[PDB]
Design a protein around this ligand. Structure first.
Ligand SMILES: [Mg+2]
Ligand SMILES: [Mg+2]
Ligand SMILES: [Mg+2]
Ligand SMILES: [Mg+2]
Lengths: 727, 727
DNA sequence: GAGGATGACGATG
DNA sequence: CGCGCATCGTCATCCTC
DNA sequence: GAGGATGACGATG
DNA sequence: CGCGCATCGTCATCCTC
């Protein structure tokens, strides 16, 4: 038996015929993986091993429409390759002997998405044929995530925690050469043959040992066990949190050569990791409202003062480098474009400037130009909102061995609620609308003043239509429509997230030329739009128009978008995921944290100015001794210098200690060691002490006011400029 | 009349009905362009202007199969939008009044490809309806290529030569801010509205003024007038060459606001530019065998010593930056992967190392992994082949204001013939096979020695089959096939450029399951390949096998690839395009140029060592005067120093002049100004003079020998290592 | 058989 | 994750007459 | 009417 | 130059019963 449908199958010469139950199918993610397996099969052979590449994220068959399952080419391909039959139940040897292959070995990069791909496969097979899992039908081939070699002494690590542990355990680091393998494409064909040489260390057969697996699998992919996953993940986050505090290491898989892994083990030990990571990359943080990647871009932009405009692609490059971002430059540029966008319904306050074409309301930012043709920059408001001073309090992460972005940035206003937040993870989702900046300021000012905050209603920059609140967390958005004549009507605005094109297609054209079931509603329509505004003109029949009116134009022309924010799930500064029942809830938490961090900033300010005036004190003494002739140790032997210093009592350069030593002293008279200079210097030290005095006068809740004032003045400027430009 | 097929058409509200002959269609390259036009149409209106985006390189309808013309969705879309009918001839007002639009305005980036897109359109309309061109049916909207602004004083330039001329003409440069617009996506919507404001400066209607245009157009796109283009372009290259020598400027279009342009003007002034550029980017240079982009990557790699491996994507980044490469990072990475490839039939000598998966013989380098997962580096042989010393003689280009790669690199062996060369341009093509490196060396050694070169036969690294020469420039390549049994046969090797997959599909599977017309030839086949080698095993009928043998296995199993190199068109060091009738021809030209450049290198060596020993001479005098007490001007007033120096006669630091001043003198005694140091120094100067003496002993044709010897030793090493690794 | 359609090859849209 | 369209010149086939 | 299919939204393969 | 597949959780419709 030979398959002749799909050319991408390098079937096992023996598979299909006799002994087929002893042939395995390597399923690989991507084509290159397939090729790597092939490079590997030069060792084990081509009779008992076939190779086939998976496209990407396999379908979730557990809860998918029969149509979707059928239309799905890949699943069909797999069935065709293995000789599976949905209807047939494989509980018997005859059923087994039917299959063209004996086992299926899945190989994916030692990356969490990989765990996800494995999962989806297991879910597939499980949903479609419970019995097979028991039979030891599925196998996993694993390749090291990291390699450390030194002097022809190679050490391979298949877990990041395992490697971290090796580093924690063993000294003399910085001696070994370390290289990361973030994708099967990274390891050479040699390395591949080598892998396949040590087969036992890379082969992990999946063992069904009890019913827990059936539950565990369903826990992972059943579309009715969301809450189960919410708990399942909250547990994870919690155990993790507790492990962190205690300073305990976390347990890792694949530590040594382990023969088999239970489906339950896989799910709860490996798959859950992915899920949490998905969450971490999908759902933003209440503090900055930014997802890691966005935060990496922003951090990057901050890292370079970069006053001149920069080519997006280039910036993306530098970001990939500086921000130690590992998920490619495409997503990154996309992220940058997202950050820079400022069309109606997108961002109320864009941090990055769109110097060129970054997509319009026509196509929902999709119509944007090539990253290599467009330029960006930080907007003036950007650093105002993220004070240059605050980042002394931010905890910066050193993952990948390199200093990168913090865990969150501390904005003077809650950014989450001004640019909203949209995310899809595992067991969780996020939807937060935009809110007017002024109102935010006001409520922060109001709350700071010592008064309860005013209720806030979703606001979208440059949006003309109206937003009503039918209920708590339930709103309805309506675009503007005017009745010109009994023969003509005018659509001035559309609801948010309604794109001119999408509308033209989905709503108008169908009304223009009615479908088999219903007749046309309109006779013709003209459109005089722009990139920034919309304007349809629809001609109808006086009757049909009358009926439309009687029913409601906003309802007829689907100019009313309703949305309920019952999902507002965000990350706590501690890193835990909380779901916010109100906007004000968030606003409160933010206010609190921000205030505190103003406190800390103050402390930091006290630190600097103190180290300064103190350095000026130790500087001050030397001049007095020399001027006052109470100490003449100039040019005296260097040891005598130190000795006298330690005995004189005065401390060493304060600033170095503060950041965490005789340089200030070392500095020679240099034709400036006059008393009068002391007269100049005294002003400098006294000025430090005084600045501090004014600083002490300022309360944490008071500097905030300044920050806000500055922001607003700039803001007003910006808006003016923009409005004029529009004109 | 309204179009309801394609949603991407933003038809002109008036177009289709009455006055339609006054509505124009903006055809834009890319979607973003469309969007930009839209941003622009907020000024001119939506009644008389429709917008539709072109996919890319429009079809050449002049010589295309009816099937291709029909199947072609875009052309059909255009016809559907405008209301054209192939059969109908539009010579009459009634024919005109039929069309949904009056005029068609094409807008593309002020880039040569743009000129190409315009061309293809004109060709389309011309081929399909000669009459229309006369009617002033087609219009072009043009946007500045570069903008220079300073103090709210904007100046826009629509030609690169025009800008260059502005720079040549007007002083105080480096005062103005300059920004390049390499794509319509670069200019904002504001800038768009502004463009459309000054309509007359951007609108250029195409004027048919005589029959020359009909010839000129056909000259551009007729698939039977290749030679005509060869001449047409040789003229260009020549006029250009003459203009260059004389130091005359070149004439540019769009200089000022010019109302209309003749099709002949367009073709011969604008389109030809593109064609030559296509040639320049398509066809390599005989000297290095590298195309610009490749040369930019290589130059980049050379620019950074870069001993540690670098992530392809990253390298690509740095290349885009340093090499001032403007055509994106995709093509660039692809280029890098190409350079680094080393599978059978690819590169005999890969300059870059494939640290990871860069594609195999399975899929012709196509199966390669993601640029972000793979790493590269310069191979050890790489700089040996491009001596670090030679690049002092190379002319480096400063285009885009930044120092970039040279025009060619000077290899110790002709690289063109070792890695071959493949290109497709306009009016020209290029095909050069690979040749064995040793043989190259030998023939260079042989030619250098003073003897005529041995004939050379195409050689492909690690290729096992055989290459025969049926005639001059005509070869046939045969893979290895052995007859195991009367029931089994073995395919050991395939011809070059025959990929395991492509073969499996195109040749074997059809033989396995015969088509409606013919029956199967084989009963079954097994495959035990690797990434580096191929091995099929085919089972047949004794009869069918016998017949196959009687006919010839190599012929039956299409294991014989024939190829004729009658096209070997390359760029001369002067930059002109020459077609080489033999390989040896090339080899000769190369040898000559290389030798000469060894000469020059020698001269450069004389320059350096001379400036050195001379600097040591002027250094030497000072010590003698001080030691000899014939000059005691130490610490003497600085002017007296200079005065005495100029009067003493001895020259200033030679090295600075050589590159194209009292620093060597300035350097203080510093506790080393002893005579004995003079004793040490004298050895240093004498050593310079002696090194030179040995250098003079060496002839240009003699150092080459050294270079070659070094290369070979490394080469042998490399090959050994590789072979062992393979083992 | 001859003659016209075809397709890979590579840097581009 | 995957896929396809196009130009432009050779050159070797494959297919229809 | 209700109930199950559907699809956008966004960072990923 | 263009296009599409998939996961994962809400949430508002659209469609079939
Ligand atoms: Mg991966
Ligand atoms: Mg372009
Ligand atoms: Mg062709
Ligand atoms: Mg769904």
């Amino acid at each position: 038996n030979r398959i002749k449908g799909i050319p991408k199958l390098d079937d096992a010469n023996d598979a299909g015929g006799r002994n087929s139950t002893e042939c395995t199918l390597i399923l690989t993610e991507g084509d290159s993986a397939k090729t790597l397996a092939v490079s590997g099969l030069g060792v084990v052979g081509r009779d008992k091993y076939g190779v086939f590449p998976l496209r990407g994220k396999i379908l979730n068959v557990r809860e998918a429409s029969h149509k979707q399952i059928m239309e799905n080419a890949e699943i069909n391909n797999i069935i065709k390759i293995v000789g599976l039959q949905y209807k047939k139940n494989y509980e018997d040897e005859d059923s087994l002997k039917t299959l063209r292959y004996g086992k299926i070995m899945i190989m994916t990069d030692q990356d969490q998405d990989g765990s996800h791909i494995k999962g989806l496969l297991i879910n597939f097979i499980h949903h479609n044929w419970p019995s097979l899992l028991r039979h030891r039908f599925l196998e996993e081939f694993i390749t090291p995530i990291v390699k450390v070699s030194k002097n022809k002494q190679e050490m391979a690590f298949y877990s990041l925690p395992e490697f971290e542990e090796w580093k924690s355990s063993t000294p003399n680091h910085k001696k070994w050469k370390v290289k990361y393998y973030k994708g099967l494409g990274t390891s050479t064909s040699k390395e591949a043959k080598e892998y396949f040489a040590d087969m036992k260390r890379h082969r992990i057969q999946f063992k069904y040992s009890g019913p827990e697996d059936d539950a565990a699998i369903s826990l992972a992919f059943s579309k009715k066990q969301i809450d189960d996953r919410k708990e399942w993940l909250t547990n994870f986050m919690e155990d993790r949190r507790q492990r962190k505090l205690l300073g305990l290491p976390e347990d890792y898989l694949y530590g040594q050569t382990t023969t088999y892994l239970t489906y339950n083990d896989f799910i709860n030990k490996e798959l859950i990791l992915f899920s949490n990571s998905d969450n971490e990359r999908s759902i933003p943080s209440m503090v900055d409202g930014l997802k890691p990647g966005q935060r990496k871009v922003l951090f990057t932009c901050f890292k370079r003062n970069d006053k001149r405009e920069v080519k997006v692609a280039q910036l993306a490059g530098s970001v990939a480098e500086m921000s130690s971002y590992h998920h490619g430059e495409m997503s990154l540029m996309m992220t940058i474009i997202n950050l820079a966008q400022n069309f109606v319904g997108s961002n109320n306050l864009n941090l990055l400037q769109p110097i060129g074409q970054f997509g319009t309301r026509l196509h929902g930012g999709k119509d944007s130009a090539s990253p290599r043709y467009i330029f960006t920059m930080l907007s003036s408001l950007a650093r105002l909102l993220f004070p240059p001073k605050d980042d002394h309090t931010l905890k910066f992460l050193y993952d990948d061995n390199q200093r990168v972005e913090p865990e969150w940035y501390i904005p003077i206003i809650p950014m989450v609620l001004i640019n909203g937040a949209e995310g899809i993870g595992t067991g969780w989702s996020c939807k937060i609308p935009n809110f007017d900046v002024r109102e935010i300021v006001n409520n922060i000012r109001r709350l700071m003043d010592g008064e309860e905050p005013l209720p806030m209603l979703p606001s979208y920059k440059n949006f003309k239509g109206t937003i009503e609140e039918l209920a708590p967390n339930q709103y309805v958005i309506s675009g503007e429509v005017a009745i010109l004549n009994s023969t003509t009507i005018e659509i001035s605005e559309l609801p948010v997230r309604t794109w001119t094109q999408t509308y033209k297609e989905q709503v108008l054209e169908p009304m223009l030329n009615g479908t088999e079931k219903t007749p046309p509603l309109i006779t013709d329509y003209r459109e005089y739009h722009t990139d920034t505004t919309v304007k349809f003109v629809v001609k109808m029949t006086e009757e049909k128009l009358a009926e439309a009116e009687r029913v409601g134009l906003h309802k007829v022309f689907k100019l009313q978008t309703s949305l309920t924010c019952n999902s507002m799930v965000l990350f706590d500064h501690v890193g835990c995921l909380k779901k916010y029942d109100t906007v004000l809830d968030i606003l409160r938490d933010f206010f609190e944290l921000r205030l505190k961090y103003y406190g800390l900033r103050k402390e930091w300010l006290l630190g600097m100015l103190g180290a300064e005036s103190a350095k000026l004190n130790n500087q001050a003494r030397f001049i007095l001794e020399k001027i006052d002739g109470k100490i003449i140790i100039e040019n005296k032997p260097k040891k005598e210098l130190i000795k006298v210093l330690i005995q004189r009592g005065y401390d060493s350069d304060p600033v170095k200690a503060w950041k965490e030593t005789f340089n200030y002293l070392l500095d020679m008279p240099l034709w400036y060691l006059t008393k009068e200079k002391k007269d100049e210097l005294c002003r400098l030290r006294n000025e430090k002490e005084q600045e501090l005095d004014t600083l002490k006068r300022k309360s944490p809740s008071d500097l905030w006011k300044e920050d806000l004032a500055t922001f607003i003045e700039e803001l007003e400027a910006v808006e003016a400029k923009e409005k004029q430009d529009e004109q």
